[PDB]
Amino acid sequence: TCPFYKKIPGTGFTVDAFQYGVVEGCTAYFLTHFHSDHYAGLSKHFTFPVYCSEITGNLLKNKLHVQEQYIHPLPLDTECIVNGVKVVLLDANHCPGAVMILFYLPNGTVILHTGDFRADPSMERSLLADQKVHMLYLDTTYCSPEYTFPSQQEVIRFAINTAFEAVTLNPHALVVCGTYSIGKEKVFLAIADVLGSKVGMSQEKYKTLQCLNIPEINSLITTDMCSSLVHLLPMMQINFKGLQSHLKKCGGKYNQILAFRPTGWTHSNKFTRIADVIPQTKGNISIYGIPYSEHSSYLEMKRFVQWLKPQKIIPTVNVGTWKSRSTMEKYFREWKLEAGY
Numbered sequence: 192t193c194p195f196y197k198k199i200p201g202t203g204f205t206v207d208a209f210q211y212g213v214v215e216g217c218t219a220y221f222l223t224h225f226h227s228d229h230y231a232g233l234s235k236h237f238t239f240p241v242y243c244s245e246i247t248g249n250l251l252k253n254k255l256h257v258q259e260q261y262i263h264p265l266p267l268d269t270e271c272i273v274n275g276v277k278v279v280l281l282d283a284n285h286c287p288g289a290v291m292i293l294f295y296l297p298n299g300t301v302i303l304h305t306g307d308f309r310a311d312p313s314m315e316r317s318l319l320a321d322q323k324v325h326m327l328y329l330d331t332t333y334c335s336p337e338y339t340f341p342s343q344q345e346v347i348r349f350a351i352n353t354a355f356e357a358v359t360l361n362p363h364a365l366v367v368c369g370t371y372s373i374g375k376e377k378v379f380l381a382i383a384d385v386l387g388s389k390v391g392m393s394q395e396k397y398k399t400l401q402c403l404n405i406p407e408i409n410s411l412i413t414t415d416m417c418s419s420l421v422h423l424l425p426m427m428q429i430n431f432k433g434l435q436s437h438l439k440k441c442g443g444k445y446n447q448i449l450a451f452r453p454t455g456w457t458h459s460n461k462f463t464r465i466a467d468v469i470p471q472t473k474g475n476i477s478i479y480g481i482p483y484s485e486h487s488s489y490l491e492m493k494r495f496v497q498w499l500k501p502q503k504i505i506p507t508v509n510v511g512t513w514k515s516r517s518t519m520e521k522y523f524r525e526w527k528l529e530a531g532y
């Protein structure tokens with residue numbers, strides 16, 4: 192059964208709630224982004240209206256085969272009426288096509304649902320500037336002060352400089368990048384751009400990328416592995432055994448692998464600056480774990496909430512334990528006492 196923090200009061204609406212069968216009283220299902228924990232349940236057999244971004248609707252039609260007649264894409268930054276209720280979709284700074292949803296309830300209450308997001312000061316100048324928000328349904332993934340990580344720009348600077356140095360030292364090195372979902376495409380696109388290569392990948396991953404409206408994509412990706420020196424593999428294969436096996440397949444073109452695992456936060460973030468990051472190495476294989484996050488750090492989250500000044504916060508992540516819930520509630524009260532709302 193659908194949990195309460197996926198229901199929008201005063202409406203017929205749910206958010207990210209496709210795994211519960213037919214939800215009682217739901218007239219429109221919203222989908223914030225195409226990540227499996229959120230889309231779980233959708234298929235060619237779904238026959239209710241789904242509301243989402245254009246990019247999410249391209250993925251629903253081509254990857255999950257949802258029929259066209261039930262996909263309702265909305266433009267961003269544009270007031271739209273859905274089943275008698277005004278809504279707006281805003282960029283969530285998460286993966287491609289990911290949105291936050293503003294709902295203007297018939298009684299005057301305004302609700303913001305962040306979906307999954309990486310808070311940024313740019314959001315302070317969106318359509319959020321113009322009005323009060325009563326209720327915030329918040330992505331609390333990293334809601335504790337131990338969760339620190341660098342900017343995405345610093346992480347990409349490290350990746351590009353690391354890959355360009357290695358391949359200039361050894362023109363017979365191959366670069367490999369791990370993936371298991373959409374998001375984090377800048378990692379492998381930026382490395383291929385500095386090296387003058389396309390990114391090589393499976394037909395299934397190429398198909399997925401072609402749904403994303405990324406400009407000049409035909410220029411940056413390929414299914415011809417032999418033409419590429421930056422290869423994408425499943426995240427599960429980014430280990431010494433899986434990389435050894437891959438290097439065999441390349442027919443003696445290469446004699447070294449430099450591999451990247453974009454993770455979120457890891458405990459090594461408590462101690463190590465991005466500059467000082469080192470790989471794990473076995474023979475001619477090196478693996479770098481790089482802290483490329485598509486979720487808010489603690490400080491980014493706190494800044495956003497202290498700017499928005501919501502009357503009530505509903506967490507949507509870390510809700511299953513009492514200890515997590517009590518910790519989050521304590522930080523929400525701190526933020527409110529410090530800022531004065």
Ligand code: NI
Pocket residue numbers: 224226285307
């Ligand atoms: Ni996500």
